[PDB]
Amino acid sequence: AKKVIYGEDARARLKAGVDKLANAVKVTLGPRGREVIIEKKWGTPVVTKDGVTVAKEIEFKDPYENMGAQLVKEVASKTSDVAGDGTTTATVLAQAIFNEGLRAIASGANPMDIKRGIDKAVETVVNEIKKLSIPVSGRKEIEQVATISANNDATIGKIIADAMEAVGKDGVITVEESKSAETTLETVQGMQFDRGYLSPYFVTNPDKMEAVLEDPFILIYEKKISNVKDLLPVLENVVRAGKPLLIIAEDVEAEALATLVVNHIKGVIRACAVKAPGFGQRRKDYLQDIAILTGGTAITEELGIKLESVTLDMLGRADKVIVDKDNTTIVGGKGSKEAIQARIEQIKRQILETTSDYDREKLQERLAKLSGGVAIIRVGAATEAELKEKKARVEDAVHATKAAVEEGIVPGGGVALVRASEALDNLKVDNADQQLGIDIIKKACRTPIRQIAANSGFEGYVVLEKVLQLGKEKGKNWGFDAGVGDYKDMVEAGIIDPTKVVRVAIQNAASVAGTMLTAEALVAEIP
């Protein structure tokens, strides 16, 4: 059984659902915004300042008010997926557009023309935002962006700025929970995986349980090695060379393992054996990428080369390798330089191909393995409850800092949307209803700065008027510093947000709110 409501009754239910969801989220906006504790069924509750986290948990008893809440939830979800930051701003913008659109529709305006006017206004706003953008120059902007996104935490900003400096432009930063109360940064460089240490006798540094080989050869092979006769010829050539040898295979099993460790123990050779990384199809994907930067050959099953047929020529050359219980890493290799950027390019074009089938971030992980280093930021706190909140802030700053590198930075504190809305006064359309949609966006663009001031204990409209007049008296970048409560140059003060975050938030908010405004009837099941 279904019930259908029309007209003002339908919009009243939608507005109530949107408002209730937005009210809970909007309390976390700004530097002086407060946190929301979310009930978890099993275990301790979750305390979070993250906008999309709060929105994902919101559901209502009324079916029609729930429909409004679910639609606006997609604003925060899409913003989080694309930008990773600005979810609270997007939710605030979505509520402002919907509320103003309802007022315009209540005056008799055509909902379709209002949506068309909204679309035109956003295109102008996005173009104005891009013109106001500033490229990231160096560590100063990186640290400033990270500090602001981490809720004005200088400690987090310094760590992330160091992390980006170490891993370079092509690096990948990962955030994990630390086992202690301290927060540490771990950076590794080279092609490293999660195997190694087949036997305890493969030890060269007894003080650290680490096996380090100086100028070692590597053996890339895709199947198990268990026959002694096929295993012998490679070391027969290797012992002639005299350099250490490292085994990367499916498994070194029984007799083949036995002869390798015993021969190593006698001291005639220096060798180690590790498992090859991956499972299923990851075997071909990983070993090929391991072989490309080592200067050797993968010796795959397709090449049709037996173990006895191998020689020193196709064995790759490495400088140093370190093997422990879990981690095996290589410092460098003999692989040609032009090959790695070809693989780097091949992955980047494959991103569009992989996006249709991927479910893991291994697409980016492979890129950073042969192009730089991967940093792991271990967030630590005295108690898990504080750890969850701190880890969320670090992840928010990491995502925001990455976006700043891509599309530059913009003045923070909502000033960028205020400046962009100033260009909407010159935009004119032939349709009166489409003009109303433009006015809706202009009012909505100035909403976030008012909400930030309201959360800080200041009147939103008083701040907005001063910021508007400061654009002409002082400059575009001048705004309101809600942290301490005065007006200053936001860019010089370090209060900046990525251009991507601002652009994504306004585009997502208008897309959902504009679609919602064209509704006339709601169909839902009778409880």
Added chain:
Amino acid sequence: AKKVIYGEDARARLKAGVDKLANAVKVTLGPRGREVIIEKKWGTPVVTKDGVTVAKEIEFKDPYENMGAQLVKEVASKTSDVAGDGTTTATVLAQAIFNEGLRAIASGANPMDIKRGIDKAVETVVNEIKKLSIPVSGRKEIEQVATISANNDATIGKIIADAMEAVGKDGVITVEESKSAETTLETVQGMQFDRGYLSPYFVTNPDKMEAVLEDPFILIYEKKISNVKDLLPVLENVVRAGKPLLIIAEDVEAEALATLVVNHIKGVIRACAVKAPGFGQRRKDYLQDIAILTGGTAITEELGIKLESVTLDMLGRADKVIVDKDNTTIVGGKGSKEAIQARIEQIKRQILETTSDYDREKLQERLAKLSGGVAIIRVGAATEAELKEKKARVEDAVHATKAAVEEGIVPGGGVALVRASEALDNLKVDNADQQLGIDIIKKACRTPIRQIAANSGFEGYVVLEKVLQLGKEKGKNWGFDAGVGDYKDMVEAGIIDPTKVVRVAIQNAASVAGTMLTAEALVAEIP
């Protein structure tokens, strides 16, 4: 347990059910019609302007009112299945016929004679519609039809007009969700399938991961190739020929794959191997269609030819082939021209045979593969909520544009039904009750234009009277432009809709409404 209601009580329940379903659907009619949000149990709600989508979700608690709603739901469902457009118009027509029929029956008319009179009137209306039809001349009518069906979206109309131009008359247009916010058109030509790239070493263009073969042979074979001795004789011949060779087989396994890649790596030959498309019976269906246009032989199991017995003569010839991870395509072939025309005639004659057993659109896909190209329109939007609405509009315009090619165009905005109803004044019958049925259709035919004007903020009867007098003063094609609110020539203004959509809508509406009018008793279970 059952309860039976009779007479006026039975018709009252049916009218309430029909009206409630029609009221929800009719709000989406016209260029200024508004959308309906439909609750979904899991996930975000669906916002749609599509008439049949809204009608499919409607259900009522009262068993007798539900029977009325379910019967009218078949009007929109059948119209969508046959024409793909005009579902809202069909629902509006069905309500008008049922409401007018109830009034005539309440005066004492025979329901059976009313149904007979309705059937006669529809035959006259359909004949008048065909007389008013105009054949599609070129891209201008195609773009105009697509724009109107897409709710006056010029961007969608331009893309679909380009898509039809590229794929020709025999092409197939597919609509898919884009991974980005932009909407793009992708067109491929020739026989292509979803296999390829057996081994990574089959690369001729490292800059695009594409294996392109210049003037290659193809090997059509239906089973696995694993034996070494049977594979060699075909390469012993083509290495004499020297041109590239491509393998289409169930699988190239182990040793047979090993010798192929190693031989290719050494540079003596250039070759690639792909899987045969389809599953189960589809292998036989597809390989024969692959072999027919390449000028070679399928080398099927029935022919009883071993691998060693093959030669160059039965191997087909192709100009270019491109192989990647998923897509393998052929540009041309040596197949005889008269053979494919037989195949397309066979498939078209098999359409009536396939319609009794098919569950997939592969019947048309095979048609366009060897007779033209297939276009994929990737609809993109910032948010999935807007994406679903945009994709629905594109699909509606694609179906409407195809129908316009088949049976021509006719003036839009409900003018065609108004002009057709004018011919019902000259139709006379000997039975008074059958005359009432004719008058029912005449009133119903003029309902959609009134509803469109009502949705646009204009009085329906005032618009209808002006449109009726404009038929004599100006011409048949003159109507009311509800988009801007004036009267103009609909055909010249580009406000046109397919003749098939109009013909199907009136026929389906009268078939169900006429059947319902003959009811006297309703039997339903007691809740």
Added chain:
Amino acid sequence: AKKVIYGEDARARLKAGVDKLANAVKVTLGPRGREVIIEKKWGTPVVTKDGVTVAKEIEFKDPYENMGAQLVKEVASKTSDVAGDGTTTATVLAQAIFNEGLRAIASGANPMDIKRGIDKAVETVVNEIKKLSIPVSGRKEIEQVATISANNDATIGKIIADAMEAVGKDGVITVEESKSAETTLETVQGMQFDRGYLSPYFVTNPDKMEAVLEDPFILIYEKKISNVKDLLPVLENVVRAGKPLLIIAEDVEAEALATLVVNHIKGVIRACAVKAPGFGQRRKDYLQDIAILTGGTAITEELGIKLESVTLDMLGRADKVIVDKDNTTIVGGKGSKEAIQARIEQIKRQILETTSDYDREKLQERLAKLSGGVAIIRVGAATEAELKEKKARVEDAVHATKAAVEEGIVPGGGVALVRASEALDNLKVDNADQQLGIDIIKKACRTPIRQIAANSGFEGYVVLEKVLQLGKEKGKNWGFDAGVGDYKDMVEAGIIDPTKVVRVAIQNAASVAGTMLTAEALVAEIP
């Protein structure tokens, strides 16, 4: 469906939940604190004075009051995990910080700045606590710490002091339930495991069912021994040696067992056979540690040495071994001294590595086996109800005594927090709200001493004022002895707490309470 509450209503629910949980726990604080009986679904109820045990069972019907209770439960849980003592003090501190923080927020202070001020104050308090710490000198401080942690039980303190003296610094103390009413201390030294006594005929002391071997050889081997021909050579050369031989193998099966016992019965050789300890991967972990301190070789599978190829050189030497139904222990061996230092050194560094994968305390067990002895304190009582309470007190004192060895001791009775809070008067910050957070910690630090006095029948504020003035008149270590009710030097009187317990309790309490103070909204499911 969810409901969201804001502002004062949200904090009121949180305060009620925190207070109700804290009120139940706080009745157990101090030497004159009382116990809490906890209902168990099956079996007798549990009577306990342990703070974290009481807190773990607390749950409330109101969803929002439950969120407050669950958050504070993490204070006691984390304190118990890290320190093992002071859970009641941590819960009392957490309630004091939250209650004072609510009052400050109700005056209009910024919650985020209050949290920042709290963090700064705790850093000063922890630094002051470390300055006030005193290292443990010997048995006197060890006995005093154990006595206080065991609720002023001199019998428990004497036993634990003896246990630490026997096992040394690297030893491990285990607490188990005794089968009788008496409490006994059992200490074993050497590498001992839970196997032995394969056959009843391996008896050298018929007065105890103990097989004692004088200067025996041990055979370390990882698989079953069942073939007679491979089994003979190991006795063929040890019978030449003439010393007793002991078998450590996966199993001695059938014929190999038969020839071993029969030859022993004849008196020509002295021998015994035991199973090797561990399951799964524990075989390689344990036999290697067994072989390292005996001076022999593990003869593992990787070494590729057959049974017939063994000799006396690779067999280790030991002084004495005792074998019974369950326990097999070795007194000493021929292992080189520096080898076991490295193994001890290898293990402590492996603690950080195995902490991410371990689920058993075998990390410390392996370290204690070759570095000293392990002690088992068997707690006994007349009835199981008293046994559970007594065992909990012993475990509390064992954990507290271990913490005292690590980070030293500090004056007890809450004096240390009072002295540390005195240093907060000199701490100043530029932010007024951050200053309020400092004052919150200062009041909270003096709460536990007031609660202890309240539980003892004295006025908390009267005691606190006297203790504050005694710091200047007499000294830092002077405090209130709640046991008898007078003021004296706590360090000289033996009322001392570990520095680790005090430091952990204040850090955990502030981490949780500060996080909850920043909340503004609560989201929970509607029941």
Added chain:
Amino acid sequence: IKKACRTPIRQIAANSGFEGYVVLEKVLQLGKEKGKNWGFDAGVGDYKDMVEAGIIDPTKVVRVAIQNAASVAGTMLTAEALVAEIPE
């Protein structure tokens, strides 16, 4: 008391149809920029000098109102028991 003293001006602004807190902030700013007598006129929505405009009140009315309101509120804050007859 400071919050209470600033309540009647917000109520007057709210009744006339303006935002009370915005009006209060403007009046506070005008105290330093223009003078103490500057305030908000409610008959017409503009800020002007109340003394010059003739919108003035006796100082006895203001003095008595704040004293009387604080007196009754103080007694009710410390009230501990209410005694009333059971109805009917």
